Amino acid sequence: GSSGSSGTGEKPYICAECGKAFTIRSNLIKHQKIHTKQKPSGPSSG
Ligand SMILES: [Zn+2]
Numbered sequence: 001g002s003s004g005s006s007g008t009g010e011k012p013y014i015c016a017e018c019g020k021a022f023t024i025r026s027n028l029i030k031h032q033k034i035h036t037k038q039k040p041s042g043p044s045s046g
Pocket of ligand 1: 015016017018019020031032035
Protein backbone atom coordinates (compact mmCIF):
# COMPACT_ATOMS: atom_id res chain seq x y z
CA GLY A 1 0.00 0.00 0.00
CA SER A 2 1.28 3.42 -1.03
CA SER A 3 -0.05 6.97 -0.67
CA GLY A 4 -1.90 7.97 -3.82
CA SER A 5 -2.09 5.04 -6.24
CA SER A 6 -0.28 1.75 -6.82
CA GLY A 7 2.28 1.43 -9.60
CA THR A 8 5.31 3.31 -8.30
CA GLY A 9 7.32 0.50 -6.75
CA GLU A 10 6.28 -3.13 -7.15
CA LYS A 11 7.82 -6.59 -6.73
CA PRO A 12 10.58 -7.42 -9.25
CA TYR A 13 8.37 -10.24 -10.54
CA ILE A 14 4.61 -10.56 -10.99
CA CYS A 15 2.71 -13.49 -12.50
CA ALA A 16 0.25 -12.87 -15.33
CA GLU A 17 -1.92 -15.98 -15.14
CA CYS A 18 -3.51 -14.59 -11.98
CA GLY A 19 -1.47 -11.58 -10.91
CA LYS A 20 0.67 -12.61 -7.95
CA ALA A 21 3.96 -11.19 -6.66
CA PHE A 22 7.28 -12.79 -5.72
CA THR A 23 10.86 -11.95 -4.72
CA ILE A 24 12.93 -14.90 -5.93
CA ARG A 25 12.85 -15.47 -9.69
CA SER A 26 12.57 -19.17 -8.87
CA ASN A 27 9.85 -18.80 -6.24
CA LEU A 28 7.75 -17.42 -9.10
CA ILE A 29 8.53 -20.20 -11.56
CA LYS A 30 7.29 -22.85 -9.13
CA HIS A 31 3.95 -21.04 -8.95
CA GLN A 32 3.52 -20.91 -12.72
CA LYS A 33 3.21 -24.68 -12.32
CA ILE A 34 -0.19 -24.37 -10.64
CA HIS A 35 -1.17 -22.61 -13.87
CA THR A 36 -0.41 -25.70 -15.94
CA LYS A 37 -3.35 -28.10 -15.72
CA GLN A 38 -2.69 -31.78 -16.44
CA LYS A 39 -5.68 -33.51 -18.04
CA PRO A 40 -6.41 -36.93 -16.50
CA SER A 41 -5.62 -40.28 -18.11
CA GLY A 42 -8.84 -41.56 -19.65
CA PRO A 43 -12.47 -40.46 -20.03
CA SER A 44 -13.43 -37.10 -18.53
CA SER A 45 -16.25 -38.58 -16.45
CA GLY A 46 -16.74 -42.30 -15.88
ZN1 LIG B 1 -0.54 -16.90 -11.25
